[PDB]
A paper describes a structure:
The Aerococcus viridans L-lactate oxidase (avLOX) is a biotechnologically important member of this flavoenzyme family and it catalyzes oxidation of L-lactate and O2 into pyruvate and H2O2. Common characteristics of their structure are the (β/α)8 barrel fold and arrangement of protein subunits into a functional homotetramer. The FMN is bound at the C-terminal end of the internal β barrel. A special and interesting feature of the catalytic center of avLOX is that it contains a third tyrosine (Tyr215), which forms a weak hydrogen bond with the pyruvate O2 in the wild-type structure.
Crystals of the Y215F mutant grew in the P21 spacegroup and had two tetramers within the asymmetric unit. Also present in each subunit is the FMN cofactor and a pyruvate which both bind in a similar manner to the wild-type enzyme. Residues 200–215 in subunit D and 200–216 in subunit H, which reside in loop 4 had no corresponding interpretable density. These residues form a short helical structure, which could function as an active-site lid, and residues near this range have been observed to be disordered in other structures suggesting an inherent mobility. In the six subunits with observable loop residues, the pyruvate is bound in a manner very similar to the wild-type enzyme except for a difference in the interaction with the amino acid at position 215. The interaction in the enzyme variant positions the nearest Phe215 ring atom within ~3.5 Å of the pyruvate methyl group to replace the hydrogen bond with a hydrophobic interaction. The hydrogen bond with Arg181 is also lost. In the two subunits without observable density for the loop, the pyruvate maintains some of the interactions between its carboxylate and Arg268 and Arg181 but shifts in the pyruvate and both of these side chains result in weaker interactions. The k5 of Y215F (20.3 s−1) at pH 6.5 was lowered 7-fold compared to the corresponding k5 of the wild-type enzyme (141 s−1). Evidence that k5 was nevertheless slowed down in the Y215F variant compared to wild-type enzyme at pH 6.5 could be explained by the development of new interactions between Phe215 and the bound pyruvate.
Author numbering:
A (entry chain C), B (entry chain A), C (entry chain B): 8 to 374
D (entry chain D): 6 to 199, 216 to 374
The structure:
């Protein structure tokens, strides 16, 4: 499996261009596994087009200069209001794999979310992170004991938070992977205690198929008790699941449609956020994801009730293209892109963004 | 008439791809008789896009495992909440014709609907049905006795329900058929009793022509008294017709626009179901059709007030590609596809699906 | 100037196809003068797409058979609720010019509207009409005497109503005609008196330029008083103009935007009709035009508050393809087309069309 | 650095202004051509500026007793032939050799107000030549150093500027994808200046520029009505609704969708200049009916400059006037005040209808 191995910074004019550029260095099956989404990919187009439903205003004479993008979340100072989303199998994009990404995230100065379906070990990622804050994302086992072990091992690694992803009890209808009969070209060290024998050669359907299908609120309570760490429930799109999660002991709400890779013919993630934030009414922090590509998106997410956003596909396309330097280039882009938007909207800091007016656009994408 | 005859299962990644796949093997006239719709087919595209007006929510920690797709309608236990739609002249799609389809539907475990314009005899379909349940769909003659005869034969063969298709009192303006100058290349045994000889060589326009134009509610009463069977009234888009049908004695309502093949410049069928369902007010069962293509459209219909759905073009496209096994592949796909959707929306059984929240998308297809 | 001369019936499948088909046998300039409209023709597209804002319901068990398209307007019995709209310079479409169209309309059994910018004389047209009813459409001269003159000639020739086209005090910005430097290849005998020459070699801007710009409500009183005939005011899109015209003695309101050939960046004509019909509140008859192409449109117009529609561009493509007989085929197409629609909508007669429920589509054209 | 703008001077036939964009791409150097035509991000907000005109639609009106409509109007004492003036734009040299002076002469002979950018490729003297006694407003980009502002404003009152336009929506550049991709470097210098422009602009800066210049000040870049309140309160004599032809903030609305709410907050306290997207008489009319007092034209004049110097520019100003004159006739507008009273049709379907 010929993954790219080249390391370097890259010019990021916009993050949409990176998809096509990565398509040229990443193996066909893997690239489309990274890029693709459920069905004819309509709900992924909605993730992207929802950004035009709410439009930013330029603001004049605001007494603003050198905006400060820093913020804080569960006591982690970070350089911008974004973090790295859990993404499986970075190996698919670059030989340095999760360590590559980790090192970029670490040096940028934000949080790395580690995925249960990681291609690399904790040890290999820890050396990439070099003491940087990390949270861990769990896809659960059926067997309770294996869950205690993963959470224990994750804690020993230093994870200061746990992410329950619950939107993937079975796989989404990912036509690209099915037509390419994709199977993972390496193992998943952390979870293979419950695939028992390698993830290599298996499809994402049997992997999700061996994880826990029958997740209940009790699982959120349980994980919080055992881990002793703050718990995010990730994949939420209906506000009712925000109440349920919080009542179950979640310390944060992660709004997300899994980048349209799960339930098809669903709304674009950003359209669900206001309602969810209104229900949460600031009881816990909110991380938002699924379709962020621009600083104008980070702003809009913040203005709409998110505390931070999680970045995914672009950072993977950066990795592919220049390893940890390519990824850092993408993180650096987002900060600078955000820094421009703050200046033109009268935002001195991250709290100002959360308070911005938004122009409602009933006409949508075609205007 | 060079129908395909090859029998086999097929991969089904989605049902849309089947269209182009069938055109390569089904001859020009018959293929376009099956695919196309009235006018420029704007309403057919409406049936497809209506699905994007109400969107599903993913639900999390719903305590759901191995969802059950079985439901019951008018005493029949069926494996999934869908039935086969009455479709004429399956010979256009495949040499095994209505028998092929019958075998698949019966072997899958759901109800077959028999078209009065079937290319095969009642006897030939029975072979195919090997005991499975059937409903009979009548295009009424003008002569009463001939209605009684047909209903009596239908009931003789085993029909447990009669479907009155009342939306075809004259043909829609099917441009593809006018320009191809399409005429049926074999006869219709159940109805030639009222044609100018045999249905072979005739346009659908004159066949409908030979059928009853002046259909009134007295006909619903008459069919039900005579047949002593449940009568569904089919082709309903407007709520008043549903009340009228029920007062006239109908035992179910069948929401349909005939796959856009009749009145042009009308709404997508799905946009009309809620208002019809409110007027029905759970007095009788509702079957929905016209545009179903995914498990998600199956769930959205039940959620909006149907009890089951009817499948059409997709099953025919499959039958063209692999006879009874091609058709079976398609039904199986709709079942697996529904199963995924139930799990992700947090529906343990079919009754849960009818209680689902939908997201209103006022932006429409382009979002 | 090489206009078509062939006379024959034609196969009309839909009226949209006729446009491209007439382009094959009509000289570039004259064709594009017929086909085009103001600006980028966005408002011509709005005229067509507005039909998708209100969608017809099919209705079942309506007890309808052989519907009757006949109707009556200001005491004229006619075979269908449509009339021929006034259009200049028919000789650009066909050698028989306005006499061929007259023959078509008269044989069909509806009303002919004569343009003041006709290229036939009153006697040539009158010959094709062989006694059929006619309405005369005036573009006013600046000089009062010449207005009295034209009306005297129109009443003497048989006209039973006068149509005041008032939406063209100056020309639309018709981009096709400027780029083609289009000018008329023959004279216009009826208005010649107030052009300082012959209409031959003149642009439509300079012709409209000679006509009265300063049309006021007194111009309506005066035409009524002089003619003694019922006066339609034509080009209305704003309800206030309906009040104004009726208050000035108009006996009819003709809703129109000149088939999008005048004011650019304006609504599709059909969207403007309900408001107008409400303000009119049945004080006088309403003719609708500007975009009619199908029987569904005729039904929607009548259901939205029109008594009749007027046909235009497609009748002229008809004339190009087969002179009076091609034209007749189009009228006969509209008659048949509306007949199917009445059958499926449950309309026995023309009055029934006026009471139809329409489904509201807020999603517009892409749905 | 090397720049080879077209130098031919001629009148052109303008059928519509959309066609001028591509026509001018055939005779303007690629880099500079796309500097003028391009916008931020993937230009969705520039497309938004154009499509907004389809949100409100004009009605034809009949028997309005109208003839020879009159497009003249008046703003802060200036009598102008049409309710449009020229927007402030930099680097006219990018379009034509005659640069700002060419545009000046078209604007002057036509009979409306030239607006002069601080970042112009020409001297006040070179521009005054083309202007030939005609009226001018000076648009400032503020420097950090107060003395330079005061010096540039004195200079501008010296040349005869009768208003000052403060442009506050460019505290940092838009994200112009084309310029980055084409590594476009500005080919000439800006002799009215000499980057470190004033980021931290406040209301106090409005007060100060009114107070020193002693001229009417317009605030330019407004898309939020609060900012109209802030401007009038700080002493602005005018409000200039603009998103900078979409060359600035991305993923924002089309300028014309924001106009009504601003007009409503302004309450005719000061006059309103509107811009960003104007391409037809139909748009001048809708801007006016939606609360504007005059519009500013930009890209289409420049494209006319490119194709025919002052005479191309002029052909464009001429086009708008005739185009607007057609619309007035068909809408029942005798004069420019009548346009501000026009009813508009609400189109909730959007561009696709
Ligand atoms: C290739 C890929 C792999 C992913 N793997 C995981 C995973 O293992 N666990 C998880 O919770 N989310 C996973 N996600 C979802 C992301 O955390 C996030 O929700 C998504 O990337 C946001 O969409 P965007 O990247 O298009 O902005 C994955 C997404 C992608 C594209
Ligand atoms: C080729 C074809 C033939 C049909 N023949 C009949 C028929 O004989 N009787 C009837 O009641 N409906 C008939 N229908 C309508 C179907 O019962 C059903 O309404 C339609 O196929 C559903 O739309 P879809 O297939 O596009 O989802 C036919 C539909 C198609 C596409
Ligand atoms: C080529 C052409 C010539 C026309 N000439 C006239 C005319 O002389 N007088 C008039 O009142 N309307 C004229 N009209 C407008 C028609 O009366 C009518 O409003 C229009 O054709 C309806 O639009 P449609 O043809 O797209 O349905 C003309 C329209 C066309 C297309
Ligand atoms: C190439 C270019 C340069 C510009 N330079 C300036 C400038 O220096 N100062 C300023 O206030 N506005 C500037 N603008 C904005 C214009 O004043 C005006 O707001 C814009 O042209 C309106 O967009 P439109 O011409 O596309 O309708 C510029 C616009 C363009 C396209």
């Amino acid at each position: 499996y010929n993954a790219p191995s080249e390391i370097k910074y890259i010019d990021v004019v916009n993050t949409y261009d990176l998809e096509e550029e990565a398509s040229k260095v990443v193996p066909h099956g893997g690239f489309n596994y990274i890029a693709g989404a459920s069905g004819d990919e309509w709900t992924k187009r909605a993730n992207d087009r929802a950004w035009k439903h709410k439009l930013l205003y330029p603001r004049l004479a605001q007494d603003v200069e050198a905006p400060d993008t820093s913020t804080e979340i569960l006591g982690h100072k970070i350089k911008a209001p974004f973090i790295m989303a859990p993404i499986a199998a970075h190996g698919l994009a670059h030989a340095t794999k999760e360590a590559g990404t980790a090192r970029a995230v670490s040096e940028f100065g934000t949080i790395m979310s580690i995925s249960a379906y990681s291609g690399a070990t904790f040890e290999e990622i820890s050396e990439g992170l070099n003491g940087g804050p990390r949270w861990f994302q769990i896809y659960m086992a059926k067997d309770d004991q294996q869950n205690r072990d993963i959470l224990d091992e994750a804690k020993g690694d230093g994870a200061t938070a746990i992410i329950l992803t619950a939107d993937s009890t079975v796989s989404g209808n990912r036509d690209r992977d099915v037509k390419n009969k994709f199977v993972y070209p390496f193992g998943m060290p952390i979870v293979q205690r419950y695939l028992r024998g390698t993830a290599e050669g298996m499809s994402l359907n049997n992997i999700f198929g061996a994880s826990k299908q029958k997740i209940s609120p009790r699982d959120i309570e349980e994980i919080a008790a055992h881990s002793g760490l703050p718990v995010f429930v990730k994949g939420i799109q209906h506000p009712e699941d925000a109440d349920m999660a919080i009542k179950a002991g979640a310390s944060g709400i992660w709004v997300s449609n899994h980048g349209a890779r799960q339930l098809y013919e669903a709304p674009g993630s950003f359209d669900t956020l206001p309602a969810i934030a209104e229900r949460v009414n600031k009881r816990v922090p909110i991380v938002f994801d699924s379709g962020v590509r621009r600083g104008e998106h980070v702003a809009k997410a913040l203005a709409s009730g998110a505390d931070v956003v999680a970045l995914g596909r672009p950072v993977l396309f950066g990795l592919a293209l220049g390893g940890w330097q390519g990824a850092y280039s993408v993180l650096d882009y987002f900060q600078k892109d955000l820094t421009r938007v703050m200046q033109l909207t009268g935002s001195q800091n991250v709290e100002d963004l959360k308070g911005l007016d938004l122009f409602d656009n009933p006409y949508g994408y075609e205007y």
